[PDB]
Amino acid sequence: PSLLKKLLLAP
Amino acid sequence: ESADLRALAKHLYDSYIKSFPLTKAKARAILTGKTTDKSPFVIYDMNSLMMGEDKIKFKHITPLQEQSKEVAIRIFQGCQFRSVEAVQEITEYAKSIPGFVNLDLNDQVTLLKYGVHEIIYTMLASLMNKDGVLISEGQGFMTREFLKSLRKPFGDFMEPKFEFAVKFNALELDDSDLAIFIAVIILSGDRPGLLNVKPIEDIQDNLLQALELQLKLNHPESSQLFAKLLQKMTDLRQIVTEHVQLLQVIKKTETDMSLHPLLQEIYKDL
Ligand SMILES: O=C(NCc1ccccc1)c1ccc2c(ccn2Cc2ccc(Cl)c(F)c2)c1
């Protein structure tokens, strides 16, 4: 699971 | 054409101000003693580090002080913690660059990976002079000398960043210049594993035009500033390469080190 992807999809 | 380029520059500067709490303007004010704020606590040696140490931002199970008996490892962890928050800031900024969020999400991720180390060292130069670096949101100043005095491998950790910073700061960029420069770095089409290269190259072409115009207007008497700055982008890549090499050394020698999962993701296959 990408944490970068998680940060990108954050509001 | 030029109107749109100026609008792009202003959009990027506004987003930069929103994303990055400590700007070059603020840092230089602090460094030059031109602020009303109380001047930073200086860590120049082991005793000043005790006092100052509790000033470093680190948030974990136990305080920074209890992480290792070795001072170099505690400083290392401080740098790591800051790096994680810096990646978060750069990610927010990247989201504001027109066209970025419309790219393939995996390409967004790739751009951030390779890009974030280069941007961290660019902005790090904003916090440096030849004698040391601002830390803890400008509330502290750690000397270059003290950092250089740490035991190997850690003693050579920051020195290439200071060397880069001396040259880079000689260019006298301001925050508006930097906002565009950083956007250019993020939008590099030659990052390994990029799925759609052409859209990224298109955006970077536009940003590069905006940068060129910005440097001509903001620095009319600085000849070939644009050229000098592009060559700095390449320099940064070399800085990162040497940093990763050092990190591999550290990984083999010291098992007292632990990387945050975000940084692990960034370093894997890099
Ligand atoms: O090389 C870096 N990140 C990459 C990295 C480093 C360590 C582990 C995994 C990845 C790096 C180095 C220095 C940095 C920053 C951001 C600010 N500084 C200045 C500074 C100086 C002293 C202290 Cl105590 C501090 F907290 C901050 C980033």
Side-chain angles (χ1 to χ4, degrees), chain A, chain B residues 1-255 258-270:
Chain A
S2 168
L3 299 175
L4 280 177
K5 192 169 292 187
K6 286 178 172 169
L7 291 169
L8 284 167
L9 297 172
Chain B
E1 178 73 29
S2 74
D4 296 333
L5 293 181
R6 293 311 294 159
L8 180 55
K10 181 179 186 300
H11 173 81
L12 291 174
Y13 173 73
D14 293 331
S15 306
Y16 170 106
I17 290 303
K18 295 309 177 183
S19 308
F20 306 109
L22 185 55
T23 59
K24 185 171 178 174
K26 287 170 172 175
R28 292 300 296 158
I30 296 172
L31 288 172
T32 56
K34 288 185 179 174
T35 177
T36 66
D37 286 347
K38 187 169 67 172
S39 63
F41 188 86
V42 175
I43 296 168
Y44 64 96
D45 76 342
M46 290 301 311
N47 283 340
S48 52
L49 176 64
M50 302 290 293
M51 316 191 272
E53 181 175 71
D54 82 357
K55 291 183 78 66
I56 298 165
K57 194 184 172 163
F58 181 85
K59 302 279 185 184
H60 208 264
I61 303 174
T62 56
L64 179 61
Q65 183 181 63
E66 294 187 28
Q67 290 306 123
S68 179
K69 295 177 180 173
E70 170 63 64
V71 51
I73 291 172
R74 305 205 297 274
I75 294 174
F76 182 81
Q77 285 295 321
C79 294
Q80 177 185 128
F81 179 96
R82 169 59 194 148
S83 295
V84 168
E85 294 200 340
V87 170
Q88 299 169 348
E89 291 161 5
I90 296 164
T91 299
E92 286 309 297
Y93 182 64
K95 284 154 81 168
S96 77
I97 304 170
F100 180 87
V101 296
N102 300 324
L103 302 171
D104 185 307
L105 185 58
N106 287 319
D107 279 356
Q108 298 181 33
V109 170
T110 293
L111 291 178
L112 279 174
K113 193 173 173 173
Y114 293 92
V116 288
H117 271 81
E118 290 164 16
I119 297 156
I120 285 172
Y121 297 143
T122 301
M123 305 188 66
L124 189 56
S126 295
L127 311 182
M128 286 172 160
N129 60 25
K130 66 176 185 64
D131 295 337
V133 59
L134 291 175
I135 62 174
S136 302
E137 306 172 5
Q139 300 168 33
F141 183 85
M142 190 170 288
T143 68
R144 182 177 177 175
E145 181 181 49
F146 176 66
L147 283 165
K148 200 165 184 172
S149 75
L150 301 176
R151 73 155 169 92
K152 309 294 190 184
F154 301 97
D156 297 323
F157 190 76
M158 292 299 293
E159 194 65 3
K161 285 76 164 172
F162 277 110
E163 286 289 311
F164 172 82
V166 166
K167 301 188 172 77
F168 193 77
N169 287 344
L171 301 183
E172 296 189 355
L173 303 187
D174 64 24
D175 292 302
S176 55
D177 304 326
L178 290 168
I180 310 173
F181 183 59
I182 289 165
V184 170
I185 287 172
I186 300 172
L187 272 300
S188 309
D190 61 341
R191 306 306 194 182
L194 282 177
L195 304 169
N196 311 325
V197 166
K198 182 57 161 60
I200 296 171
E201 290 177 326
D202 284 341
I203 297 174
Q204 192 187 56
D205 179 27
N206 192 32
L207 293 171
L208 278 168
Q209 296 182 37
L211 180 56
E212 183 173 341
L213 182 56
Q214 167 72 19
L215 297 176
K216 282 177 188 180
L217 296 172
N218 201 27
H219 303 273
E221 308 304 320
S222 181
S223 58
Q224 300 296 331
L225 181 56
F226 182 64
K228 297 179 183 180
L229 193 51
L230 297 161
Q231 296 176 316
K232 297 302 179 190
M233 287 172 62
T234 299
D235 289 342
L236 288 160
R237 291 197 181 179
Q238 185 57 32
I239 297 299
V240 175
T241 293
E242 294 178 13
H243 170 77
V244 170
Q245 292 174 349
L246 181 60
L247 184 56
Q248 293 169 347
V249 169
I250 296 168
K251 288 173 54 193
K252 287 182 180 178
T253 301
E254 339 257 339
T255 306
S258 62
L259 287 180
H260 188 286
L262 178 58
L263 301 185
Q264 286 188 48
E265 173 187 8
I266 291 161
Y267 284 121
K268 178 176 184 293
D269 305 324
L270 178 147

PDB file of all heavy atoms in Angstrom, chain A residues 2-5 7-10, chain B residues 95 105-106 109 112 261-262 265:
ATOM      1  N   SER A   2       0.631   2.137  -0.967  1.00  0.00           N
ATOM      2  CA  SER A   2       1.436   3.342  -1.093  1.00  0.00           C
ATOM      3  C   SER A   2       0.985   4.425  -0.113  1.00  0.00           C
ATOM      4  O   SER A   2      -0.177   4.829  -0.111  1.00  0.00           O
ATOM      5  CB  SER A   2       1.375   3.868  -2.526  1.00  0.00           C
ATOM      6  OG  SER A   2       1.912   5.176  -2.612  1.00  0.00           O
ATOM      7  N   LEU A   3       1.907   4.898   0.717  1.00  0.00           N
ATOM      8  CA  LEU A   3       1.587   5.989   1.635  1.00  0.00           C
ATOM      9  C   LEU A   3       1.528   7.314   0.877  1.00  0.00           C
ATOM     10  O   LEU A   3       0.752   8.205   1.228  1.00  0.00           O
ATOM     11  CB  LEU A   3       2.604   6.053   2.775  1.00  0.00           C
ATOM     12  CG  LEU A   3       2.664   4.783   3.633  1.00  0.00           C
ATOM     13  CD1 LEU A   3       3.772   4.867   4.665  1.00  0.00           C
ATOM     14  CD2 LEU A   3       1.333   4.546   4.313  1.00  0.00           C
ATOM     15  N   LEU A   4       2.338   7.428  -0.174  1.00  0.00           N
ATOM     16  CA  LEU A   4       2.294   8.594  -1.051  1.00  0.00           C
ATOM     17  C   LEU A   4       0.927   8.729  -1.695  1.00  0.00           C
ATOM     18  O   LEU A   4       0.380   9.825  -1.794  1.00  0.00           O
ATOM     19  CB  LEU A   4       3.360   8.501  -2.140  1.00  0.00           C
ATOM     20  CG  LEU A   4       4.777   8.896  -1.731  1.00  0.00           C
ATOM     21  CD1 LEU A   4       5.720   8.680  -2.894  1.00  0.00           C
ATOM     22  CD2 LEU A   4       4.805  10.346  -1.265  1.00  0.00           C
ATOM     23  N   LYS A   5       0.389   7.604  -2.146  1.00  0.00           N
ATOM     24  CA  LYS A   5      -0.932   7.589  -2.750  1.00  0.00           C
ATOM     25  C   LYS A   5      -1.956   8.036  -1.711  1.00  0.00           C
ATOM     26  O   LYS A   5      -2.857   8.821  -2.012  1.00  0.00           O
ATOM     27  CB  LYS A   5      -1.252   6.195  -3.296  1.00  0.00           C
ATOM     28  CG  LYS A   5      -2.470   6.129  -4.198  1.00  0.00           C
ATOM     29  CD  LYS A   5      -2.555   4.780  -4.917  1.00  0.00           C
ATOM     30  CE  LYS A   5      -1.431   4.610  -5.937  1.00  0.00           C
ATOM     31  NZ  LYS A   5      -1.588   3.370  -6.761  1.00  0.00           N
ATOM     32  N   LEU A   7      -1.422  10.069   0.778  1.00  0.00           N
ATOM     33  CA  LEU A   7      -1.274  11.507   0.981  1.00  0.00           C
ATOM     34  C   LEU A   7      -1.894  12.274  -0.186  1.00  0.00           C
ATOM     35  O   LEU A   7      -2.522  13.313   0.013  1.00  0.00           O
ATOM     36  CB  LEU A   7       0.203  11.885   1.155  1.00  0.00           C
ATOM     37  CG  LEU A   7       0.909  11.419   2.435  1.00  0.00           C
ATOM     38  CD1 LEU A   7       2.416  11.626   2.328  1.00  0.00           C
ATOM     39  CD2 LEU A   7       0.367  12.148   3.663  1.00  0.00           C
ATOM     40  N   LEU A   8      -1.727  11.754  -1.399  1.00  0.00           N
ATOM     41  CA  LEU A   8      -2.292  12.385  -2.591  1.00  0.00           C
ATOM     42  C   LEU A   8      -3.813  12.426  -2.562  1.00  0.00           C
ATOM     43  O   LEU A   8      -4.427  13.395  -3.012  1.00  0.00           O
ATOM     44  CB  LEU A   8      -1.831  11.656  -3.850  1.00  0.00           C
ATOM     45  CG  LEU A   8      -0.395  11.922  -4.290  1.00  0.00           C
ATOM     46  CD1 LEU A   8       0.026  10.922  -5.334  1.00  0.00           C
ATOM     47  CD2 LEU A   8      -0.270  13.341  -4.823  1.00  0.00           C
ATOM     48  N   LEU A   9      -4.417  11.374  -2.023  1.00  0.00           N
ATOM     49  CA  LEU A   9      -5.868  11.245  -2.019  1.00  0.00           C
ATOM     50  C   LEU A   9      -6.485  11.879  -0.778  1.00  0.00           C
ATOM     51  O   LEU A   9      -7.693  11.806  -0.571  1.00  0.00           O
ATOM     52  CB  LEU A   9      -6.258   9.773  -2.123  1.00  0.00           C
ATOM     53  CG  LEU A   9      -5.804   9.130  -3.435  1.00  0.00           C
ATOM     54  CD1 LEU A   9      -6.036   7.630  -3.422  1.00  0.00           C
ATOM     55  CD2 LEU A   9      -6.530   9.779  -4.603  1.00  0.00           C
ATOM     56  N   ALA A  10      -5.648  12.499   0.046  1.00  0.00           N
ATOM     57  CA  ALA A  10      -6.119  13.240   1.211  1.00  0.00           C
ATOM     58  C   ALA A  10      -6.783  14.552   0.793  1.00  0.00           C
ATOM     59  O   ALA A  10      -6.495  15.081  -0.280  1.00  0.00           O
ATOM     60  CB  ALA A  10      -4.959  13.512   2.171  1.00  0.00           C
TER      61      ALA A  10
ATOM     62  N   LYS B  95       0.052  18.984  -5.639  1.00  0.00           N
ATOM     63  CA  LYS B  95      -1.366  18.915  -5.977  1.00  0.00           C
ATOM     64  C   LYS B  95      -1.874  20.241  -6.518  1.00  0.00           C
ATOM     65  O   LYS B  95      -2.815  20.275  -7.317  1.00  0.00           O
ATOM     66  CB  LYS B  95      -2.180  18.481  -4.760  1.00  0.00           C
ATOM     67  CG  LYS B  95      -2.041  16.991  -4.495  1.00  0.00           C
ATOM     68  CD  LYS B  95      -2.260  16.624  -3.040  1.00  0.00           C
ATOM     69  CE  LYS B  95      -3.723  16.519  -2.683  1.00  0.00           C
ATOM     70  NZ  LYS B  95      -3.879  15.881  -1.345  1.00  0.00           N
ATOM     71  N   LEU B 105      -2.474   8.487 -11.569  1.00  0.00           N
ATOM     72  CA  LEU B 105      -2.146   8.543 -10.146  1.00  0.00           C
ATOM     73  C   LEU B 105      -0.797   7.885  -9.837  1.00  0.00           C
ATOM     74  O   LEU B 105      -0.028   8.378  -9.000  1.00  0.00           O
ATOM     75  CB  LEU B 105      -3.261   7.898  -9.323  1.00  0.00           C
ATOM     76  CG  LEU B 105      -3.137   7.973  -7.800  1.00  0.00           C
ATOM     77  CD1 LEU B 105      -3.047   9.426  -7.324  1.00  0.00           C
ATOM     78  CD2 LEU B 105      -4.308   7.259  -7.150  1.00  0.00           C
ATOM     79  N   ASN B 106      -0.491   6.791 -10.530  1.00  0.00           N
ATOM     80  CA  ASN B 106       0.806   6.137 -10.365  1.00  0.00           C
ATOM     81  C   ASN B 106       1.974   6.991 -10.859  1.00  0.00           C
ATOM     82  O   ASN B 106       3.095   6.885 -10.350  1.00  0.00           O
ATOM     83  CB  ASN B 106       0.821   4.791 -11.088  1.00  0.00           C
ATOM     84  CG  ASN B 106      -0.001   3.747 -10.377  1.00  0.00           C
ATOM     85  OD1 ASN B 106       0.023   3.644  -9.149  1.00  0.00           O
ATOM     86  ND2 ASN B 106      -0.741   2.966 -11.146  1.00  0.00           N
ATOM     87  N   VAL B 109       2.622   9.523  -8.171  1.00  0.00           N
ATOM     88  CA  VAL B 109       3.398   8.877  -7.120  1.00  0.00           C
ATOM     89  C   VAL B 109       4.881   8.788  -7.491  1.00  0.00           C
ATOM     90  O   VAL B 109       5.757   9.074  -6.664  1.00  0.00           O
ATOM     91  CB  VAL B 109       2.828   7.466  -6.811  1.00  0.00           C
ATOM     92  CG1 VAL B 109       3.760   6.676  -5.907  1.00  0.00           C
ATOM     93  CG2 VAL B 109       1.448   7.586  -6.178  1.00  0.00           C
ATOM     94  N   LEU B 112       6.549  12.252  -7.352  1.00  0.00           N
ATOM     95  CA  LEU B 112       6.817  12.619  -5.964  1.00  0.00           C
ATOM     96  C   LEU B 112       8.020  11.864  -5.393  1.00  0.00           C
ATOM     97  O   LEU B 112       8.911  12.472  -4.824  1.00  0.00           O
ATOM     98  CB  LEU B 112       5.573  12.401  -5.104  1.00  0.00           C
ATOM     99  CG  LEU B 112       4.578  13.558  -5.217  1.00  0.00           C
ATOM    100  CD1 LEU B 112       3.300  13.249  -4.461  1.00  0.00           C
ATOM    101  CD2 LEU B 112       5.207  14.843  -4.676  1.00  0.00           C
ATOM    102  N   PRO B 261       8.027   4.326   7.321  1.00  0.00           N
ATOM    103  CA  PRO B 261       7.474   3.614   6.161  1.00  0.00           C
ATOM    104  C   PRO B 261       7.326   4.479   4.904  1.00  0.00           C
ATOM    105  O   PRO B 261       7.460   3.962   3.789  1.00  0.00           O
ATOM    106  CB  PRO B 261       6.103   3.154   6.664  1.00  0.00           C
ATOM    107  CG  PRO B 261       6.271   3.032   8.132  1.00  0.00           C
ATOM    108  CD  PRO B 261       7.225   4.111   8.536  1.00  0.00           C
ATOM    109  N   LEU B 262       7.054   5.770   5.076  1.00  0.00           N
ATOM    110  CA  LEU B 262       6.958   6.680   3.936  1.00  0.00           C
ATOM    111  C   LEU B 262       8.310   6.815   3.234  1.00  0.00           C
ATOM    112  O   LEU B 262       8.407   6.772   2.000  1.00  0.00           O
ATOM    113  CB  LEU B 262       6.451   8.055   4.384  1.00  0.00           C
ATOM    114  CG  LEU B 262       6.339   9.139   3.304  1.00  0.00           C
ATOM    115  CD1 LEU B 262       5.417   8.697   2.166  1.00  0.00           C
ATOM    116  CD2 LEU B 262       5.853  10.452   3.913  1.00  0.00           C
ATOM    117  N   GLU B 265       9.192   3.603   1.397  1.00  0.00           N
ATOM    118  CA  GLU B 265       8.547   3.593   0.090  1.00  0.00           C
ATOM    119  C   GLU B 265       9.330   4.435  -0.907  1.00  0.00           C
ATOM    120  O   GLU B 265       9.473   4.061  -2.071  1.00  0.00           O
ATOM    121  CB  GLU B 265       7.108   4.112   0.171  1.00  0.00           C
ATOM    122  CG  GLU B 265       6.466   4.280  -1.209  1.00  0.00           C
ATOM    123  CD  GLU B 265       5.103   4.956  -1.178  1.00  0.00           C
ATOM    124  OE1 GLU B 265       4.689   5.445  -0.108  1.00  0.00           O
ATOM    125  OE2 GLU B 265       4.446   5.007  -2.238  1.00  0.00           O
TER     126      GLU B 265
END
